[PDB]
Amino acid sequence: MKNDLIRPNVLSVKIISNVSPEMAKKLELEPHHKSLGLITADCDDVTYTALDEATKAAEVDVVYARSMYAGAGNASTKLAGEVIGILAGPSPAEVRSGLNATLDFIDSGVGFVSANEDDSICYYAQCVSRTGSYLSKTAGIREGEALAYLVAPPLEAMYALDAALKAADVEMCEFFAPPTETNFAGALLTGSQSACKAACDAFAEAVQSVASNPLGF
């Protein structure tokens, strides 16, 4: 239904001790990163937000994070979902803490929101009040600054990003040009917490406007 949360799910979790030199080199790991935590899930941008939160709760860095082509609904295998993330830390203890924090966030009630009856249009309008080390690096902002994390399907996102930019004193940090691997689009916007919230609200309203009247021009 409209305004329902689309529930995100974790599919697979694994820890590696004493990562191989070859893999460390290929992943451009820092010397302290001896352990890796792997995770996959069926919702990419929620998971990216979750991994960022994990960098606040534990001594881990996000060293790999990528989306799958055509989204979770089109996965051909059980554990692929639509995202893989890799946390790195000095030992399995730090990594375990980071994975647990990631899991907790994914199960916290955050998620994409449905814009219609059969949940075939949905969006993400998440105000991150304090970034961790991953989304702050992605956006090119100081760790701890706020972000509006806005994602919707391609036309909805372009229309709604424009509305969001006009509604608040925010800057465009990163543009996810359509298509992302999952055939969405969006942006990371920064500003005061107030400004990011205003942008989130305006984005949500604008996506809903297009969902309610897709051919109205």
Is 217 a binding residue for Cl ion by CB under 5 A? The answer is: yes
CB of 83 to a second copy, least distance (A): 9
Is 3 a binding residue for Na ion by CB under 5 A? The answer is: no
Query: Which residue, 7 or 14, has its beta carbon nearer to Cl ion?
Result: 14
CA quadruple 86, 87, 92, 96: dihedral positive or negative?
Answer: negative
Q: Which residue is nearest to Na ion (CB)?
A: 74
Is 216 a binding residue for Cl ion by CB under 5 A? The answer is: yes
CB of 216 to Cl ion, least distance (A): 3
To which residue do tokens 């701890």 refer?
144
CB of 14 to Cl ion, least distance (A): 5
Is 70 a binding residue for Cl ion by CB under 5 A? The answer is: no
Query: Do the Cβ atoms of 46 and 9 come closer than 8 Å?
Result: no
Compute the CA torsion angle 125, 128, 132, 134 (nearest 10 deg): 20
57-80 burial, b if ≥16 CB within 10 A, otherwise e?
A: ebebbbbebebbeebbeebeeeeb
Query: Do the Cβ atoms of 145 and 131 come closer than 8 Å?
Result: yes
Query: Which residue, 142 or 217, has its beta carbon nearer to Cl ion?
Result: 217
The pair of structure tokens assigned to 4 is 């329902």
Binding window for Cl ion (CB under 5 A); candidates: 11-19, 81-89, 98-106, 108-116: 11-19
The Cα 66–Cα 78 span in angstroms is: 17
Is 213 a binding residue for Cl ion by CB under 5 A? The answer is: no
Q: Which does 32 bind (CB under 5 to 8 A by kind): Cl ion, a second copy, Na ion, none?
A: none
Query: Which residue, 161 or 200, has its beta carbon nearer to a second copy?
Result: 161
The pair of structure tokens assigned to 175 is 């543009």
**Integer angstrom CA distances of residue 11 from 36, 64, 131:** 17, 17, 25
Query: Which residue, 59 or 107, has its beta carbon nearer to a second copy?
Result: 107
Q: Return the residue of 74, 108, 194, 212 that touches Na ion, per CB under 5 A.
A: 74
Q: Which does 44 bind (CB under 5 to 8 A by kind): Cl ion, Na ion, a second copy, none?
A: none
Helix or strand (DSSP H, E) at 61: strand 61-67
Q: Return the residue of 15, 19, 80, 165 that touches Cl ion, per CB under 5 A.
A: 15
Binding site for Na ion (CB under 5 A): 74, 117-118
